[PDB]
């Protein structure tokens, strides 16, 4: 997308979202990141929405194929699951490459740095979902390390109702439950995050309250599923 203006890529990413063309949206936002400038809050959300939707569809397809393959216990189901898996890994590697070159290193404000480290944890978590064996251990640790750095910054620099802090804790709790085989850590993190947010809601405007309580309900929904 090197010949397209940054502002045109951003505008087209917004149009692609409205048209539910998320692969296009991700390609436009990759082009925008590769212009080399930092991203605003709105632009960070465009980048995350685009790739989360693309990889979310790949994950759903991989899960369908993996279930068929496991029930089967010819080579076609495995081959096609492997094709989808390789495509998913490629998208995760692309996102991780954008974060490493050079979004994270240029992100100095807590909001941007936590946002990008949360994304880094997420895309390593998606790699971990399809990984087997030993490199699987290192992929899991890479997710953990990214989430932990984001947690450390969020606890020092953001209030306990901040929606990025809350969403980070939500996703790190999913990591603990679904990837790291640590359901008690997942439950403890979700509960402590929920309770500390509840105690800070009194400080918020109506609009901030709506945002924080939305993510609190997601934490509660997981706690209900896990307990």
């Amino acid at each position: 997308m090197g010949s397209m203006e940054r502002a045109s890529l951003i505008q087209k990413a917004k149009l692609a979202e409205q048209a539910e063309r998320y692969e296009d949206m991700a390609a436009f936002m990759k082009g925008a990141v590769e212009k080399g400038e930092e991203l605003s809050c709105e632009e960070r959300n465009l980048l995350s929405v685009a790739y989360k939707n693309v990889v979310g569809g790949q994950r759903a397809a991989w899960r369908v194929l993996s279930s068929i393959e496991q029930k089967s216990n010819g080579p076609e189901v495995r081959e096609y699951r492997e094709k989808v898996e390789t495509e998913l890994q490629g998208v995760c590697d692309t996102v991780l490459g954008l974060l490493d070159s050079h979004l994270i290193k240029e992100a100095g404000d807590a909001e941007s740095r936590v946002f990008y480290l949360k994304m880094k944890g997420d895309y390593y978590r998606y790699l971990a979902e399809v990984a087997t064996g030993d490199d699987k251990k290192r992929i899991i640790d890479s997710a953990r390390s990214a989430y932990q750095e984001a947690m450390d910054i969020s606890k020092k620099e953001m209030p306990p109702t901040n929606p990025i802090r809350l969403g980070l804790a939500l996703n790190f709790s999913v990591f603990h439950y679904e990837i790291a085989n640590s359901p008690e850590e997942a439950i403890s993190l979700a509960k402590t995050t929920f309770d500390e947010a509840m105690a800070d809601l009194h400080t918020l405007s109506e609009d901030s309250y709506k945002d924080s309580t939305l993510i609190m309900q997601l934490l509660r929904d997981n706690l209900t599923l896990w307990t």
Binding site: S48, D122, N171, V174
Partner: peptide
């Protein structure tokens, strides 16, 4: 379990 959605909806 649910992770954060891309948009509030």
């Amino acid at each position: 379990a649910g992770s954060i959605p891309g948009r509030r909806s």
